Amino acid sequence: PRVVFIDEQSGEYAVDAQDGQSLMEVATQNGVPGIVAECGGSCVCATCRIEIEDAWVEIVGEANPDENDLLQSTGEPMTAGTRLSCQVFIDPSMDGLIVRVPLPA
Numbered sequence: 001p002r003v004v005f006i007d008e009q010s011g012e013y014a015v016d017a018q019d020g021q022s023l024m025e026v027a028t029q030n031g032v033p034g035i036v037a038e039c040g041g042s043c044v045c046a047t048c049r050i051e052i053e054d055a056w057v058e059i060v061g062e063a064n065p066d067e068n069d070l071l072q073s074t075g076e077p078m079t080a081g082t083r084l085s086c087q088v089f090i091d092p093s094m095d096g097l098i099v100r101v102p103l104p105a
């Protein structure tokens with residue numbers, strides 16, 4: 001597909017992806033800040049607080065109440081589309097996706 005990332009360093013990172021790729025991997029491919037490099041998708045960390053644009057959350061489908069709960073346990077605020085991007089992946093359902101990065105969290 002096609003894609004569009006965002007961040008607080010460039011305020012945008014237009015890109016593209018392929019069914020099976022996450023919005024965290026495109027980044028590094030798009031030269032995006034790639035501000036993560038934590039577990040690499042191993043599913044052992046929870047700091048990859050990425051944010052899908054507010055148009056594709058209903059397209060991407062944030063994480064279930066399992067991965068979203070453990071993260072909410074802390075008590076920090078969250079918006080619509082906040083989910084482990086690294087755990088997300090492209091499909092002919094989320095083509096031309098638009099990503100986003102939260103504030104210093």
Ligand code: FES
Pocket residue numbers: 036037038039040041042043044045046047048084085086087
């Ligand atoms: S990068 Fe570790 S869970 Fe997303």
